Amino acid sequence: KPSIVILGAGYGGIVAALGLQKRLNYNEADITLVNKNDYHYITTELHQPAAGTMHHDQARVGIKELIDEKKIKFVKDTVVAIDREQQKVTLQNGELHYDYLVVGLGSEPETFGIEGLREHAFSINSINSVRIIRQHIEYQFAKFAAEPERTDYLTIVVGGAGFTGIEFVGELADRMPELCAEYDVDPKLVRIINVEAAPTVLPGFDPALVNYAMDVLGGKGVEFKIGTPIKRCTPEGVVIEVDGEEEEIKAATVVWTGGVRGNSIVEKSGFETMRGRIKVDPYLRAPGHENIFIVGDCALIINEENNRPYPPTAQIAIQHGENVAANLAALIRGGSMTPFKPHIRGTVASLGRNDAIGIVGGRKVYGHAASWLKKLIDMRYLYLIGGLSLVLKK
Amino acid sequence: KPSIVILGAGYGGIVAALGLQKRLNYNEADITLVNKNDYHYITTELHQPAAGTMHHDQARVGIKELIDEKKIKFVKDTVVAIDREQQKVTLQNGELHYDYLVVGLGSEPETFGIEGLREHAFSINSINSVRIIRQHIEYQFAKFAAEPERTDYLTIVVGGAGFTGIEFVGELADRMPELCAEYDVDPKLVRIINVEAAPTVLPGFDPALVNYAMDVLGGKGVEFKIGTPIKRCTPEGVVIEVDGEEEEIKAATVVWTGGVRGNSIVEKSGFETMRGRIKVDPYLRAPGHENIFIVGDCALIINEENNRPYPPTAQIAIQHGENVAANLAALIRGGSMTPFKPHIRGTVASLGRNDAIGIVGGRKVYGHAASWLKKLIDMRYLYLIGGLSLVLKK
Numbered sequence: 173k174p175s176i177v178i179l180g181a182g183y184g185g186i187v188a189a190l191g192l193q194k195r196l197n198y199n200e201a202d203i204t205l206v207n208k209n210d211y212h213y214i215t216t217e218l219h220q221p222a223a224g225t226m227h228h229d230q231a232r233v234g235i236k237e238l239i240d241e242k243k244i245k246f247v248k249d250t251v252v253a254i255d256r257e258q259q260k261v262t263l264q265n266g267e268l269h270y271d272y273l274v275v276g277l278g279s280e281p282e283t284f285g286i287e288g289l290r291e292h293a294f295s296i297n298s299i300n301s302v303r304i305i306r307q308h309i310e311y312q313f314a315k316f317a318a319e320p321e322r323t324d325y326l327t328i329v330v331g332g333a334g335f336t337g338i339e340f341v342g343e344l345a346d347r348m349p350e351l352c353a354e355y356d357v358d359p360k361l362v363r364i365i366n367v368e369a370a371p372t373v374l375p376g377f378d379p380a381l382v383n384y385a386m387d388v389l390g391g392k393g394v395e396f397k398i399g400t401p402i403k404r405c406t407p408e409g410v411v412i413e414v415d416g417e418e419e420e421i422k423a424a425t426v427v428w429t430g431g432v433r434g435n436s437i438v439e440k441s442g443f444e445t446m447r448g449r450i451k452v453d454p455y456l457r458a459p460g461h462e463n464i465f466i467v468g469d470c471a472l473i474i475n476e477e478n479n480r481p482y483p484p485t486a487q488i489a490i491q492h493g494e495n496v497a498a499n500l501a502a503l504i505r506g507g508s509m510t511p512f513k514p515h516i517r518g519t520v521a522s523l524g525r526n527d528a529i530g531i532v533g534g535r536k537v538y539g540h541a542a543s544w545l546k547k548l549i550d551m552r553y554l555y556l557i558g559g560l561s562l563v564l565k566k
Numbered sequence: 567k568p569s570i571v572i573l574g575a576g577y578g579g580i581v582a583a584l585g586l587q588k589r590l591n592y593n594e595a596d597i598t599l600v601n602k603n604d605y606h607y608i609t610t611e612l613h614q615p616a617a618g619t620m621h622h623d624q625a626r627v628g629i630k631e632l633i634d635e636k637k638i639k640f641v642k643d644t645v646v647a648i649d650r651e652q653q654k655v656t657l658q659n660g661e662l663h664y665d666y667l668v669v670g671l672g673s674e675p676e677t678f679g680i681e682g683l684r685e686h687a688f689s690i691n692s693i694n695s696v697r698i699i700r701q702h703i704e705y706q707f708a709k710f711a712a713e714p715e716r717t718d719y720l721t722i723v724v725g726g727a728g729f730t731g732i733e734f735v736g737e738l739a740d741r742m743p744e745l746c747a748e749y750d751v752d753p754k755l756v757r758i759i760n761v762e763a764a765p766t767v768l769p770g771f772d773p774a775l776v777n778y779a780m781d782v783l784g785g786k787g788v789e790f791k792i793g794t795p796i797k798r799c800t801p802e803g804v805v806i807e808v809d810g811e812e813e814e815i816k817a818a819t820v821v822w823t824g825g826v827r828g829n830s831i832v833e834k835s836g837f838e839t840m841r842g843r844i845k846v847d848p849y850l851r852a853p854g855h856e857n858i859f860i861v862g863d864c865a866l867i868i869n870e871e872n873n874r875p876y877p878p879t880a881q882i883a884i885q886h887g888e889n890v891a892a893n894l895a896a897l898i899r900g901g902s903m904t905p906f907k908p909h910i911r912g913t914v915a916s917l918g919r920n921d922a923i924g925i926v927g928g929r930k931v932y933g934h935a936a937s938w939l940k941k942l943i944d945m946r947y948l949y950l951i952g953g954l955s956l957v958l959k960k
């Protein structure tokens with residue numbers, strides 16, 4: 173019985189684990205799933221509890237409830253290092269050996285060495301982190317009424333006007349009326365500032381969709397500072413660069429959505445990486461390793477049509493897991509593997525709870541239509557991993 | 567036509583204002599009520615929103631909803647100083663003249679010059695302050711899951727084991743199960759520590775009631791450190807004295823319930839005070855001033871039967887307001903005044919939402935009985951200032 177070890181129970185890992193579960197009979201292989209939490213969180217929904225527009229329990233599910241304990245041994249622990257030569261994974265509270273390894277440790281924030289950013293800014297990338305953001309913001313607003321001159325309490329800076337940043341400021345905008353009512357705050361004093369180094373909001377997306385997004389969010393009071401890089405971050409705010417001069421934004425809350433990289437454990441373990449990501453072979457294996465598969469945000473795929481990398485998405489992470497599960501089963505059974513080919517469908521960006529933008533079926537979508545479509549797409553993933561029961565739960 | 571100016575819309579000021587409203591005609595006197603907020607808060611209930619066991623809106627009511635605009639002119643402003651010589655009150659955004667003055671500015675925290683206490687500990691004395699405490703604590707618990715070795719996040723130190731401290735830790739204890747579930751916290755790691763310099767919890771109360779209180783709160787996991795003074799306070803915690811030696815308690819939350827004094831404006835205005843309060847004459851007037859009345863926590867009353875001071879309570883504050891309103895009406899109309907005579911009824915201390923201790927009528931009360939009695943007593947005040955409508959509201 174060969175030992176398959178899966179590192180990280182995210183989109184890539186959970187799908188891979190459940191795939192192997194469905195494809196393999198009992199005693200065909202040992203399957204160990206490692207995750208630092210006993211729950212799997214819906215990473216694509218994390219902007220909502222971060223803004224307090226949805227309870228965080230709506231964005232996570234117990235791993236034991238998803239898997240078959242007789243087929244998969246779940247281990248709750250934190251991966252520290254991978255020893256490729258010994259084929260051993262080092263954890264905080266033990267060690268594991270493998271015949272096959274699946275790395276799905278996800279992303280970590282990339283702050284590009286910008287001073288104070290790692291230590292004084294917040295990230296939206298886990299249940300813990302979004303509860304921290306949520307309660308941090310509520311704490312600032314609670315402090316304001318006693319110190320009405322401290323409008324920096326009411327200022328939130330979101331660094332990076334990409335997909336995550338745009339969805340987050342949308343949620344923040346919807347949250348503000350209730351939040352201000354809770355803490356006797358003049359809503360006109362609230363500032364939500366989206367700061368982007370690139371010269372365009374949502375750089376790389378269709379201009380028509382972008383302008384609609386900016387118009388809607390702009391209407392809701394969101395400010396955009398574009399072509400404006402953050403130079404440093406403090407607990408008092410950020411310094412930005414405007415017209416070749418430094419300008420300070422006093423803000424008690426700074427959220428970084430300006431870049432991610434593959435989990436550093438991968439690169440530190442000696443794998444050759446580009447921005448922490450591994451340019452895997454056609455079978456999603458790490459080059460030089462016939463027994464190591466890489467999924468999700470740790471994997472790098474190049475679109476051969478335009479020589480551009482696919483972005484780190486949940487959508488492609490899911491497709492990774494399905495392919496790896498299929499190919500691992502084949503390897504266990506001495507069969508031939510099937511080369512991975514991504515099929516990129518449409519993605520919808522939420523603009524608060526009642527508005528959205530995106531491409532679905534090949535057509536531009538807006539408003540309530542787009543908003544419902546996003547919910548349906550997200551529901552499909554829940555059905556994939558937890559069947560109708562998980563869908564009915566929430 | 568005399569000008570009556572009332573400073574502070576607390577128990578003393580609101581009752582006095584409503585009393586004058588009920589006793590005087592529309593042309594007998596000008597009545598101005600000054601308050602820094604447009605709302606009157608139920609100070610005796612503030613321990614609940616501080617612990618998050620009751621929404622803060624349940625502990626306040628709009629002042630305009632209580633008074634008759636044709637009889638009383640409400641001014642939303644902050645009192646800065648009182649000029650006795652000119653009979654003028656200075657505000658942050660203007661100034662007022664009076665023929666008669668009623669001072670009901672309440673208490674402010676007394677930290678006795680204990681280092682760091684004023685700057686790093688929290689007080690339960692307004693709607694703003696309890697929302698700050700509430701969100702501070704939730705913020706600490708939110709941070710814990712990401713740093714499970716920082717158990718100091720889960721330690722709450724309450725300085726002073728008097729009436730307020732006991733009620734507050736009672737509320738915190740009831741809150742903990744829900745709070746821990748919200749933030750994935752092991753409840754056994756939580757520490758609620760009541761620190762008291764005196765050698766007994768609730769010093770001055772009946773020992774039987776005290777022992778019952780400690781047993782109930784102790785069962786709920788509340789720790790008591792008695793004969794233990796706080797020496798200094800930091801954002802990291804407190805230093806305490808144990809057997810003449812320094813010991814540190816690491817705690818991200820320190821709440822001070824160990825002493826209050828009369829609002830400093832009274833002393834700063836040149837009034838002769840003892841611990842910030844004025845030892846008023848039998849008609850609740852400031853000595854040397856036949857036209858200045860002091861009510862509530864700014865007033866000091868000595869029980870002439872046993873020469874001991876009455877504690878600063880809402881119960882006696884209410885009686886102050888009624889007496890002053892009656893006596894002011896008499897002065898305006900040239901009648902004779904009535905010496906203040908306190909009638910001290912029973913007071914019940916809550917021990918969470920489902921338990922309590924106190925004296926009612928002439929018998930000691932416990933449990934659900936005591937708990938309901940406290941609610942009814944508090945309800946009586948709501949009826950006094952707002953009739954059945956306000957009662958039905960809450």
Ligand SMILES: Cc1cc2nc3c(=O)[nH]c(=O)nc-3n(C[C@H](O)[C@H](O)[C@H](O)COP(=O)(O)OP(=O)(O)OC[C@H]3O[C@@H](n4cnc5c(N)ncnc54)[C@H](O)[C@@H]3O)c2cc1C
Pocket residue numbers: 179180181182183184185206207208209211212213215216217218219249250251252276277278279296297336339435437467468469470484485486487488489519520
């Ligand atoms: C607000 C937000 C919105 C998004 N919306 C979309 C969208 O609409 N469409 C789309 O396609 N993509 C979206 N994404 C991106 C998508 O969420 C990620 O691409 C996806 O999470 C990547 O899958 P993953 O399994 O590789 O990583 P992850 O989902 O992050 O999974 C990593 C797992 O491994 C665990 N883990 C991490 N490190 C360790 C360690 N040392 N030891 C043990 N366990 C560890 C983690 O606890 C976690 O469970 C969004 C991302 C964010 C932040």
Ligand SMILES: Cc1cc2nc3c(=O)[nH]c(=O)nc-3n(C[C@H](O)[C@H](O)[C@H](O)COP(=O)(O)OP(=O)(O)OC[C@H]3O[C@@H](n4cnc5c(N)ncnc54)[C@H](O)[C@@H]3O)c2cc1C
Pocket residue numbers: 573574575576577578579600601602603606607609610611612613643644645646670671672673690691730733829831861862863864878879880881882883913914
């Ligand atoms: C948790 C807690 C529980 C309590 N429980 C009880 C109990 O059960 N029974 C009992 O008898 N007592 C109880 N007390 C004590 C009681 O609350 C006080 O004695 C009461 O509040 C005093 O009434 P007051 O009007 O003098 O002061 P306050 O109630 O504090 O009123 C002061 C008013 O004046 C305003 N004000 C203050 N300064 C200014 C300024 N510069 N300018 C303008 N406005 C100003 C304030 O905003 C406020 O509206 C409790 C106290 C606390 C903290």
